[PDB]
């Protein structure tokens, strides 16, 4: 149809939306967005927004350092251009704030999301982003109240429940987390009686229960919960990681290494497993593989303070005291802007 009559912009916009959807293609979306922007004023703003979203999605699935920053800058430029071309749409401001929050620039993103809330304050995603951003500023009660109000408005969501569980575990105690988890299980049972989504939700519920149990020092209950959860998916990386963690807590430091290796053999991009493996290997005595693992981790991602702290600690025993000091400083300055959960959990869909 585009070939037949190159006059309208709705057709390429729909094509780009379909390309960006569950089919998970990126180049065609880029081509459609460029075609739209090549040709009133609303349509070009929508094309700029789509191009920025495509750039952000491409940046998320990168593999090295520089192009990540390049694509982030391109997405920020596209978002600010779209906002300039049209200042009367809350979606553009919300997406601009979400993109800006990735670069850890907190006050500017907070101002932009405040303006977006000013335009419209009934968006569940806006409230969730506000609570997540307040979490990074170390104000737990305010975020808890925000999540409570969001739950009151939408008493059947799922992501907000997970955020509430995590915040309660970090702030109030384990009993509230247990009550929330059992309420979530009751809600899931009531809502249902094909798609893999219910199974993954149940698995996540069981994993969160195992984690809240492992935080108090009762390995038997956590082991039982994770064994029950593993009946559905016996080859997931999460269950292997949890088994490695419970073995680590048990006191036997041989099977934990095997579990971590098995988990890493499935998902090479996992971060926590490799950090735990490096920490275990450090006290063993070997200082040759740990540095390589930490360098690979810092190459894959450069937004975690734990890996920087571990690298500094392991390098302290090597001799380069200045490098260890600067790594410690980097880890400390990075920890000041660490949210409770990653910002990427919020979906980015046109």
């Amino acid at each position, epitope marked *: 149809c585009i070939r037949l009559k190159p006059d309208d912009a709705t057709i390429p916009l729909l094509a780009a939306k379909l390309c960006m959807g569950s089919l998970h293609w990126l180049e065609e979306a880029e081509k459609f967005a460029k075609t739209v922007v090549d040709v009133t004023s609303e349509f070009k703003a929508k094309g700029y927004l789509a191009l920025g979203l495509t750039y952000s999605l491409q940046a998320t699935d990168a593999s090295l350092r520089g192009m990540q920053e390049v694509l982030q800058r391109k997405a920020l430029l596209a978002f600010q251009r779209a906002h300039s071309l049209s200042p009367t749409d809350h979606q553009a401001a919300f997406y601009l704030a979400l993109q800006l929050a990735i670069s850890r620039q907190i006050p500017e993103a907070l101002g932009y999301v405040r303006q977006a*809330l000013q335009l419209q*304050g*009934d968006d569940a995603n806006s409230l969730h982003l506000l609570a997540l951003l307040l979490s990074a500023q170390k104000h737990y009660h*305010d975020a808890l*109240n925000i999540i409570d*109000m969001a739950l009151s408005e939408y008493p059947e969501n799922f992501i907000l429940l997970f955020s509430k569980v995590k915040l309660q575990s970090l702030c109030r105690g384990p009993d509230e987390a247990l009550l929330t988890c059992k309420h979530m299980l009751q809600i899931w049972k009531s809502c249902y009686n094909g798609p893999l989504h219910p199974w993954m939700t149940l698995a996540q519920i069981w994993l969160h229960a195992a984690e809240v149990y492992i935080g108090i020092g009762k390995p038997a209950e956590a082991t039982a919960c994770t064994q029950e959860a593993a009946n559905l998916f016996p080859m997931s990386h999460n269950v292997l990681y949890m088994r490695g963690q419970i073995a680590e807590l048990r006191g036997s430091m041989d099977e934990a290494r095997r579990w971590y290796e098995e988990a890493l053999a499935i998902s090479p991009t996992h971060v926590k497993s490799m950090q735990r493996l490096a920490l275990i290997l450090h006290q063993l005595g070997r200082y040759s593989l740990a540095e390589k693992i930490l360098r690979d981790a810092v190459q894959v991602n450069s937004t975690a303070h734990e890996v920087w702290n571990g690298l500094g600690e392991v390098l302290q025993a090597q001799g380069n005291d200045a490098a260890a000091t600067e790594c410690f400083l980097t880890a400390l300055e990075l920890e000041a802007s660490s949210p409770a959960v990653p910002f990427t959990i919020i979906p980015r869909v046109l």
Partner: nanobody, 104 residues
Framework: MAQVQLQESGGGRLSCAASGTISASDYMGWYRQAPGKERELVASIDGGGITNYARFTISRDNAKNTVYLQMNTAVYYC????????????????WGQGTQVTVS
């Protein structure tokens, strides 16, 4: 980096001063707490000039980011609050320690 601290004086022309920069959109309010009584919002003001009372005259200086109150027994509190109240919400972003005032 710069932490925002609030200094209140005049208890015994009340003054409340902050060493940092506060946007005019944020609300600044006076609260009262007396022994045996609950927290009560007494006065509020924005950067636009509209003031809400439940007697006193208030002035805001943006150049120095200060508030003065002229009057004619409790702890008074100066707070920096956000409204965001399509449905009557309120949050206390900054809460001070207050100062005791006794009236015979």
């Amino acid at each position: 980096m710069a932490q925002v601290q609030l200094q209140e004086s005049g208890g015994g022309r009340l003054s409340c001063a902050a060493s940092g920069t506060i946007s005019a959109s944020d609300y600044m309010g006076w609260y009262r707490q007396a022994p045996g009584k609950e927290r009560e919002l007494v006065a509020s003001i924005d950067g636009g000039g509209i003031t809400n009372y439940a007697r006193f005259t208030i002035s805001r200086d943006n150049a120095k980011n200060t508030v003065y109150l002229q009057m004619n027994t409790a702890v008074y509190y100066c707070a920096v609050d956000w409204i965001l109240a399509r449905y009557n919400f309120v949050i206390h972003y900054y809460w001070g320690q207050g100062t005791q005032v006794t009236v015979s």
